[PDB]
Amino acid sequence: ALEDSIARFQQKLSDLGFQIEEASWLNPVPNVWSVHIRDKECALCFTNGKGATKKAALASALGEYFERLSTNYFFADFWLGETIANGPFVHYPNEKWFPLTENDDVPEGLLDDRLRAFYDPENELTGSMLIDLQSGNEDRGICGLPFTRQSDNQTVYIPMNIIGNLYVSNGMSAGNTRNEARVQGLSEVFERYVKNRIIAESISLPEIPADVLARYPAVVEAIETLEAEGFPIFAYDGSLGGQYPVICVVLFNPANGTCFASFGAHPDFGVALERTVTELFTPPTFDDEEVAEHTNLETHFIDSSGLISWDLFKQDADYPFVDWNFSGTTEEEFATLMAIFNKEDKEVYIADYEHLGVYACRIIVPGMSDIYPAEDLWLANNSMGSHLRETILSLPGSEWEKEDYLNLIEQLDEEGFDDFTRVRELLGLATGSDNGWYTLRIGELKAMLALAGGDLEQALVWTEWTMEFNSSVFSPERANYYRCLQTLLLLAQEEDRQPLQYLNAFVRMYGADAVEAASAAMSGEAAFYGLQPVDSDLHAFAAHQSLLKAYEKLQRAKA
Amino acid sequence: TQTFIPGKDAALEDSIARFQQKLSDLGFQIEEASWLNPVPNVWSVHIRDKECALCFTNGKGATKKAALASALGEYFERLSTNYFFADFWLGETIANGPFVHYPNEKWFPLTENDDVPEGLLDDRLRAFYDPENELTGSMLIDLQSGNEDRGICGLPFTRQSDNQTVYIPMNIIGNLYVSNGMSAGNTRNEARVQGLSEVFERYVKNRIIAESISLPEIPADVLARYPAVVEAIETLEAEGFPIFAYDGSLGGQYPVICVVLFNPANGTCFASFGAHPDFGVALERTVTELLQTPPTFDDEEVAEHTNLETHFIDSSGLISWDLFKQDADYPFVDWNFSGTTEEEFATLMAIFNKEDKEVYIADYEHLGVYACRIIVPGMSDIYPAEDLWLANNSMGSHLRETILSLPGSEWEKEDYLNLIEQLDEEGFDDFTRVRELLGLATGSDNGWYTLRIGELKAMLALAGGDLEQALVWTEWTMEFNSSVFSPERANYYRCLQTLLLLAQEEDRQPLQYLNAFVRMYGADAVEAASAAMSGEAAFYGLQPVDSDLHAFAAHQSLLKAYEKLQRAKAAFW
Ligand SMILES: Nc1ncnc2c1ncn2[C@@H]1O[C@H](COP(=O)(O)CP(=O)(O)OP(=O)(O)O)[C@@H](O)[C@H]1O
Ligand SMILES: Nc1ncnc2c1ncn2[C@@H]1O[C@H](COP(=O)(O)CP(=O)(O)OP(=O)(O)O)[C@@H](O)[C@H]1O
Ligand SMILES: [Mg+2]
Numbered sequence A: 001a002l003e004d005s006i007a008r009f010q011q012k013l014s015d016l017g018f019q020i021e022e023a024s025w026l027n028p029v030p031n032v033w034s035v036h037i038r039d040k041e042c043a044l045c046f047t048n049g050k051g052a053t054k055k056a057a058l059a060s061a062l063g064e065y066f067e068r069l070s071t072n073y074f075f076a077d078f079w080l081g082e083t084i085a086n087g088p089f090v091h092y093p094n095e096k097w098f099p100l101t102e103n104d105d106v107p108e109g110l111l112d113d114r115l116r117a118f119y120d121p122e123n124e125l126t127g128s129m130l131i132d133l134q135s136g137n138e139d140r141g142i143c144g145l146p147f148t149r150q151s152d153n154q155t156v157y158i159p160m161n162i163i164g165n166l167y168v169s170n171g172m173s174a175g176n177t178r179n180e181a182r183v184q185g186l187s188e189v190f191e192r193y194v195k196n197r198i199i200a201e202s203i204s205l206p207e208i209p210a211d212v213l214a215r216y217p218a219v220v221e222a223i224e225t226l227e228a229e230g231f232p233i234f235a236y237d238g239s240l241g242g243q244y245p246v247i248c249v250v251l252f253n254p255a256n257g258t259c260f261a262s263f264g265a266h267p268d269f270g271v272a273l274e275r276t277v278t279e280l281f282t283p284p285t286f287d288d289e290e291v292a293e294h295t296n297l298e299t300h301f302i303d304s305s306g307l308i309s310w311d312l313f314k315q316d317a318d319y320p321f322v323d324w325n326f327s328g329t330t331e332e333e334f335a336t337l338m339a340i341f342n343k344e345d346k347e348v349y350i351a352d353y354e355h356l357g358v359y360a361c362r363i364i365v366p367g368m369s370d371i372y373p374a375e376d377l378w379l380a381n382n383s384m385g386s387h388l389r390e391t392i393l394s395l396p397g398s399e400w401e402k403e404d405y406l407n408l409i410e411q412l413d414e415e416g417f418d419d420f421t422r423v424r425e426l427l428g429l430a431t432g433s434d435n436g437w438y439t440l441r442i443g444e445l446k447a448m449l450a451l452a453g454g455d456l457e458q459a460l461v462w463t464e465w466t467m468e469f470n471s472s473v474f475s476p477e478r479a480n481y482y483r484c485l486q487t488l489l490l491l492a493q494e495e496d497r498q499p500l501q502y503l504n505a506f507v508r509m510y511g512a513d514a515v516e517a518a519s520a521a522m523s524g525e526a527a528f529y530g531l532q533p534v535d536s537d538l539h540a541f542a543a544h545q546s547l548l549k550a551y552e553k554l555q556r557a558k559a
Numbered sequence B: 001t002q003t004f005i006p007g008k009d010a011a012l013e014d015s016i017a018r019f020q021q022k023l024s025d026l027g028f029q030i031e032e033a034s035w036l037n038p039v040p041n042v043w044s045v046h047i048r049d050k051e052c053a054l055c056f057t058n059g060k061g062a063t064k065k066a067a068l069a070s071a072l073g074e075y076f077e078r079l080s081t082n083y084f085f086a087d088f089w090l091g092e093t094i095a096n097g098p099f100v101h102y103p104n105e106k107w108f109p110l111t112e113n114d115d116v117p118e119g120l121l122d123d124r125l126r127a128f129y130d131p132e133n134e135l136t137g138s139m140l141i142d143l144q145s146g147n148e149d150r151g152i153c154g155l156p157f158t159r160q161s162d163n164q165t166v167y168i169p170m171n172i173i174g175n176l177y178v179s180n181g182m183s184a185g186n187t188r189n190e191a192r193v194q195g196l197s198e199v200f201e202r203y204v205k206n207r208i209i210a211e212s213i214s215l216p217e218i219p220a221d222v223l224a225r226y227p228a229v230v231e232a233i234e235t236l237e238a239e240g241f242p243i244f245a246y247d248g249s250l251g252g253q254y255p256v257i258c259v260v261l262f263n264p265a266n267g268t269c270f271a272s273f274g275a276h277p278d279f280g281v282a283l284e285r286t287v288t289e290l291l292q293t294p295p296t297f298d299d300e301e302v303a304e305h306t307n308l309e310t311h312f313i314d315s316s317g318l319i320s321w322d323l324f325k326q327d328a329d330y331p332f333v334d335w336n337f338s339g340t341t342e343e344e345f346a347t348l349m350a351i352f353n354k355e356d357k358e359v360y361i362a363d364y365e366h367l368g369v370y371a372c373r374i375i376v377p378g379m380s381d382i383y384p385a386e387d388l389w390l391a392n393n394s395m396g397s398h399l400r401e402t403i404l405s406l407p408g409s410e411w412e413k414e415d416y417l418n419l420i421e422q423l424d425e426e427g428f429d430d431f432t433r434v435r436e437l438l439g440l441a442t443g444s445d446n447g448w449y450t451l452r453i454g455e456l457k458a459m460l461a462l463a464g465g466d467l468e469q470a471l472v473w474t475e476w477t478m479e480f481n482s483s484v485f486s487p488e489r490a491n492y493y494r495c496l497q498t499l500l501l502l503a504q505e506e507d508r509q510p511l512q513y514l515n516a517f518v519r520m521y522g523a524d525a526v527e528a529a530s531a532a533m534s535g536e537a538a539f540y541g542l543q544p545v546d547s548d549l550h551a552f553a554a555h556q557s558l559l560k561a562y563e564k565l566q567r568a569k570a571a572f573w
């Protein structure tokens, strides 16, 4: 019962030491709700609930709260600092650390044989590329988490690095029962796997007949409202000829000429239908190749503003409609779904968490659950920067030689980092919104270095870059600083002109504090404007401290 | 009550009462739209013709009445000179009427080898506008008439050294001088002094700017003389806007003040300029105009003519950082050229004589208020004479009838495709608004209002059934216009674009997508885009246009206004 689920979850969250607060409701059309819930003491811990009734949505918001604390997902994009990294356990007590080997292969106790073949077919994957982000603890080695391989009920250790880079928040769930949660999570796997096929393969799906939709009047109502509100809707059978329990529903916005495709899965057709609808841009396209691109599907996952083929909407479907149904008790539904995975010759790997007093699972199904492709462990690995962290956080206040600064630029180039990459994302820093690190990108950091190493020609290049691409999100203060610095750098290039002449004017336009700071920057003295120096427990960031305080509550719960 | 401000020859309250009355008598319903009093001692007002949206002015002054009198004075300035109608073709009836511009105008038929007819211009002007002697006569056809057969309309101007009449082609006046050096006033001389000062304002400005000059600050004890301005500046300064006040005389030569505002919030500056024989009036004029881009070290981009051309339209142009250098290139001069409007006129004219610059004035009294128009080639120019070849506002006059015929036209497909190539060969810019190129007051509620050359090329490619070109320009169209199209029209273009892209997919079956298209774009939009593709009805949203522009109600209101001026002119002669 929704009301039990809510009462229980609220209570348990409170007991755990979390002050949870309800930010903002919404009831856009009939039979559709959502709510935003937040940790009153950590801005970064928050969820979004959705359902066809108000309570359904609150229960969803709270359930996702336990899903994300149980799995540690809130903290998944952040380094947890040197103390936690060197503590008894980082992720879970039952985690397992595999030191790096002398030739840097992937240690033997990790993964299994099928996984090794899938993630690393060429056998070129090194061990040091699998260091989890949270610890960044190369000396301690590769953290691996336990997962029950389902065919033979044996434990398998999967590196947290792999889990987090390729599966992210996919196939996680929390529930009232072990099986309820697993059915939700396994369905979440079908949702996203089928979706990526329907989309990438530019499939035309078959409409759901009107007399079938009629069974679910509360959804029909939500659609008639959207349709009368000026938004054409398409409801589709995403089963691909009865195979998978997936509904797809697409909204058109004629005002902008764009479409928005939602997907949803559950063993019961009707639940799946509603799930897809409650979950409601770019126009459709005939670009067979741009739709299929991994970066398109990767977008669709983050937010659903991705490219959909016009082929989806073709009159003639590639599969017939099937009035499917896989329903029953959560226990039966779990077996029915698992049956499908067995039919596909796809090993399922589950991991159970009960340490917060609510059951929560995390489900990997390599070859289906993947959101990102394994090549990304080489090309787009979220701990690629872990080894520069200490160097970079030292820079504010640092007084190295000018060559050292200019080399770090060349290193960033040689290591192939993207200029647009946010530094706070690359190092796993919860900086909070009120300082320079919050908007600092690689390109800006290059400007800063060129200044500290006294190469004013490069400095200008990246200062221009910086403004071209950041100034719209800088604070007034900071944007002004950059305008001023830019002027002075341009003046430096004028060898005919006499800096003193312009000094009064500059002070009037930019303000004295800004001019004094931009000059310090140019003299290589204080190049790293607005960046405070950062200790290796991130005391410097109060945001990050609030993150760690939250994580302490989970560590204690784990013991 | 009677308020006599410096340099005017009549109390504000009289000037207002007179002007309002005279406007009414002329048959104009004038209405006051919106006042403003942003800082102390600075006002402005917007006045509008209740029956023509395009006829409107903006008044500015240091008191409320000063501003209203300004607004009204600029109203007579712009009716007297015909400037409201200067960007529009006036249709075939007016073009072939007794007189188009003024009764005393003069028409010079084109010659057999197409030289510029002999009664036009004089010798110094010919040397200035056309040093290479390559200017042809057919390039000088005024826009308003577009009447090549009737020839080059030329307006009379009293050359001032020897008091002789000189005929200047309306085309030249309008392309290079525009609204510069026009004025209206309470007296002949008041108006002329305002207008001649307007000339110095803009000439000196263009030197100060282009030559990246550092001006000398106006001393504080000098500013002190004009507390009402000082108050306006302190307010702007405390409001967060640094101000710089400058002597723009260039060492006492010219009666020009320059005042620059900084906006630290966006790191930009705004330079205002102003001229009047009396220092104090000039100061206030410069300040009130601050409220009716960042600086740069680019010596070359500041001087570029396109920069100074912007400054005139806009004041959002590039200023050199050099303006603000501590050390000035000229010393401050506590200048003064003042006296009675009669004396001030001579004093100013003295300066032009010193410069060896002929002044050409033209007087208008046919609306019951004196108004002048002053050309001073080599100083009054806003645009350079090279623009009579490259950027001539009647370059398109000869395609007008062809283009306005297109909606409803049923020519051969080759004819449509050629007109594209012609538009390319004649070197028109794709971004150019067609309604500006033909002089059409279309009003905001139809396809012509936003129609650019690039879109027209799309429309022609569709009518001439070249769907590959049609796509190129339909994409172009949306990339650069869709943000200003009406919902309806933007949607039509989204649909047309999809269908043109589908036409390129040789693997795909149009019928499959048909239901989906009808759902996204709507049936009307799909039916229209298909007609367009079949070359049947390509010119979407463009109604056909008769050669008196009855099709456009906006333009009709423009002509109804101009009738009132014609009758007034007839009366006077
Ligand atoms: N009574 C209840 N109602 C709804 N969800 C509940 C619930 N009890 C537990 N939950 C859990 O709360 C989580 C909320 O997610 P849901 O509302 O069911 C859609 P989701 O696809 O997981 O959201 P996502 O797109 O953000 O991933 C799920 O893991 C679900 O198992
Ligand atoms: N009594 C009066 N008070 C103020 N302006 C008057 C006036 N009588 C006539 N005018 C006229 O008002 C018209 C507009 O001039 P002003 O607005 O005061 C400066 P401007 O140089 O025309 O600015 P602008 O060219 O940027 O519009 C001029 O033709 C001016 O001579
Ligand atoms: Mg979920």
Ligand SMILES: [Mg+2]
Pocket (backbone or CB within 6 Å): A264, A279
């Ligand atoms: Mg979902």
Ligand SMILES: [Mg+2]
Pocket (backbone or CB within 6 Å): A204, A205, A206, A207, A311, A312, A313, A314, A315, A316, A317
């Ligand atoms: Mg279909």
Ligand SMILES: [Mg+2]
Pocket (backbone or CB within 6 Å): B179, B182, B183, B198
């Ligand atoms: Mg004027």
Ligand SMILES: [Mg+2]
Pocket (backbone or CB within 6 Å): B289
């Ligand atoms: Mg002015």
Ligand SMILES: [Mg+2]
Pocket (backbone or CB within 6 Å): B214, B215, B216, B217, B322, B323, B324, B325, B326, B327, B328
């Ligand atoms: Mg100066």
